C-alpha cells in the first residue's frame, strides 16, 4: 500500500489542451476570440501568483487577457464603476475579481455586480443559488477542479463517505454541495454521504469522521491538519490547502496534509504544489470559453 | 434514561405570542395590518390541513389572510398570472404557493415567480443563495422551526456532531446549512459538525455516523429509520417526518421509532405535535418580517 500521486498539473495541462482546441475552432468558425479581464486589488502575494498563473493559462489556450491592478485604497464605489465599465464592454467575455479584497470593500456586493453572463467565478448570488438547487450554473473553479480530479481518476462517490475540512463559501461549501447531491439532477452531484467540519470541530471529532471516509478533502489552510492515523487504508486524499511556511532556511508551499506520512496509507493523494491549484486554473479556462459561447 | 419529550405545540405558542405582540405594536404605530396570501392547487389532503393550520395561526396573531384554491387542472400560465397579480397588489405582504404542485407544473419556475420581498417560504433562488452565503434572508419555515426547537430547548450545537437524514432543497439541505455555519456571520449558524445522508447512504453507514451524533435530525419520510441502536445515549433526536401508517386503524408517525428511542435519547420530538407546529409558527415570523420590509 503506497498511494498513487495524482498530478493535478498534468491533468490541468490536458484540460487546457481541450479548451485550446475548442477556442481555436470557435475562432475559425468566425467568432470573436474570447477575452478574460481579471481585477487584482492590493498586494497579497498569493493573489499575485495565482493571477499570473490564470493569465499564463489564458495565453496557452488562446484566450486574450488583461490583469487590471488597483491599489488596496480604491473605494468600493470606484471598483463598482470599473466593473460596470467592463460589464458594458462587448469585447470582455469573462470578468473576475481576485479575492480576498480589503475590509472596506464588501465582497458579496462586488461579486453580485459582475454581470452573471460574465461570472466565470460562479460567485454571483444567482449562480450560487442555482448551484445549491442542482440547476445548470457556472460552477466555481476550485470546487469543479476537485470534482474533476475525483472523476477523471475514476474514484467512486455514490454511497461513499466523504469528509470536507473547511466551510468557506468559495471552496468548502460548494465541494460539499457537489459531492452530496443527486446524480440525476440537472447538474449531477456525487451522491456521497458528506461530513462538513470547520474551525470549531474538535480534532478528536474530525478524526472520528475521517477514519470512516473513502475521500478526505482538506480545505482548511492548516499545515499537517491531516495525518496518517486519521485516514483509513486505500482512501483518496485531496489537498486543497496552499500554506506558505519556512523551512532548512527557505520559504516554501505545503498543503494541509502530511504528504509523507499519508502517502504510505492512502490509495490516492494530491500534492502541493501541482495538485488542486493548477486544476483551479484549468476549470476557469473552461468557464471562460463557456461564457464566450453564450450557451448558459 | 427516559427522554425529555419536547413539546412543539408549547414552543410554537410562545413564538406565536411573540409575533402577536410584534404585529400589535406595528399596527398600533400606524402601519398597515400584515396580509398573507396562500395559493393552494388541487386536493392533496395534507396540503389542505397544513394550509388551514397556517391561516388559523395567522388570524390569532393579527395577520390577515386569504387562501386562493385552484383546481389541479390549472395551467402553468394561469398560475403565473395569479402570482403576478398578487406580486403587484400592495395589500399583500406575504405570498406562498403550497407544495407539492401537479406534475405538469414546474415547481422551480413557480417558486422563482413569487417576488423575493413577498417570499415568506424562502424558496426563491435569491433567498436560497443568500441563505447558503449566510446572509440575511427569509429562512424556510420548517428548517427555521428545527433550529428554534434546538435553541429554545438549550441543546448546544457549537462543536457538536449532527447528522441530518435527507437532502431535499426545502428541508434537509437548509437544516444542514443552518447547523454547520458560522455563529458570527450576518445570519448565524450552529457551528456544528454536520453529516448529510440520503437515499444512497447505506443503513450501515448511516448508523456509523448517527452513533457518533449529539443531534440526529430525520427528514427522510420513512417510518422507523432511526432506532435506539443507532443513537448515542443522551442525544437529541429531532423528527421532521410525518408518515401515515396502520395500527392494531390509520395513524401518524415520524421517522423515529418513538417508543424505542425515547428510552435511549436525552431529548426527542413527537409526531404529531413536534416540528409541524413550529413550521406554522416560523411562517408567522416571516410574514411580519415581510410586512416590515427590513430586507
Ligand atoms: N486551488 C487551490 O488548491 C486553492 C484555492 C483557494 C484557497 N486555497 C487554500 O485553501 C484554503 C481554504 O480556502 P479559503 O480561502 O476558502 O479559506 P478561509 O480563510 O475562508 O477559511 C478556511 C476554512 O478553514 C476552516 N478551519 C479552520 N480550522 C479547522 C479545523 N481544525 N478543522 C476543519 N476546518 C478548519 C474554517 O472554519 C474555514 O471554513 C486556504 O486556507 C488556502 O490555503 C486553495
Ligand atoms: N413540519 C414538518 O414536520 C414537515 C415539513 C415538510 C415535510 N415534512 C415531512 O417530511 C417528509 C419528506 O420531506 P422532504 O422535503 O424531505 O421530501 P423528499 O421526498 O423530497 O426528501 C426525502 C429525502 O429523504 C432521503 N432519503 C430517502 N431514503 C433515505 C435513507 N434510507 N436514509 C437517509 N435519507 C433518505 C432522500 O434522498 C431525500 O433527500 C414528507 O413526507 C413530510 O411528511 C414534514
Ligand atoms: N410552500 C410550502 N411551504 C411549506 O412550508 C410546506 N411544508 C408545510 O407546510 N409543512 C407543514 C405545515 C404544517 C404542518 C402541521 O400542522 N403539522 C401538524 C399536523 C399534522 C397533521 N397531519 N394531518 N393533519 N394534521 C403536526 O405535525 O403536529 N406540518 C407540516 C409546503 N408543503 N409547501
Ligand atoms: N475571484 C477568485 N477566484 C478564485 O478562483 C480564487 N482562488 C484562486 O485563484 N485559487 C488558486 C489559483 C491558482 C493557484 C495556483 O496556480 N497554484 C499553484 C501554486 C502557485 C503558487 N506559486 N507560489 N505560490 N503559489 C499550485 O498549487 O501548484 N492556486 C489557487 C480567488 N482567491 N479569487
Residue numbers in the entry:
A (entry chain A): 35 to 281, 284 to 332
B (entry chain B): 35 to 282, 286 to 332
Can you quote the paper on this entry?
The tool compound TH7299, as well as two of the most promising candidates, TH9028 and TH9619, were chosen to investigate the MTHFD2 mechanism of action and cancer biology. Furthermore, we determined the cocrystal structures of TH7299, TH9028 and TH9619 in complexes with human MTHFD2 to assess their binding mode and identify critical interactions in the binding pocket. At a predetermined temperature of 57 °C, isothermal dose–response fingerprint (CETSAITDRF) analysis of TH7299, TH9028 and TH9619 in HL-60 cells accurately reflected their relative potencies in biochemical and viability assays, as well as demonstrating the difference in target stabilization potential for TH9619 in nontumorigenic lymphoblastoid cell line (LCL)-889 cells compared with HL-60 AML cells. In contrast, TH9028 and TH9619 showed overall strong antiproliferative efficacy in AML cells and T-ALL Jurkat cells comparable to standard-of-care compounds, with reduced effect on LCL viability. Treatment with TH7299 resulted in approximately 50% reduction of RF speed and significantly shorter DNA fibers; meanwhile supplementation with thymidine was sufficient to fully rescue replication speeds. Similar fork speed reductions were also observed on TH9028 treatment in HL-60 and THP-1 cells. Although MTX and VE-821 significantly blocked DNA RF progression in both cancer and nontumorigenic cells, MTHFD2 inhibitors effectively impaired DNA replication only in AML cells, sparing nontumorigenic lymphocytes. The same cancer selectivity was observed for TH9028.
The folate metabolism enzyme MTHFD2 (methylenetetrahydrofolate dehydrogenase/cyclohydrolase) is consistently overexpressed in cancer but its roles are not fully characterized, and current candidate inhibitors have limited potency for clinical development. Indeed, the one-carbon metabolism enzyme MTHFD2 stands out as the most consistently overexpressed metabolic enzyme across human tumors. MTHFD2 enzymatic function supports rapid cell proliferation during early embryogenesis, after which it is replaced by the mitochondrial protein MTHFD2L in healthy mature tissue.
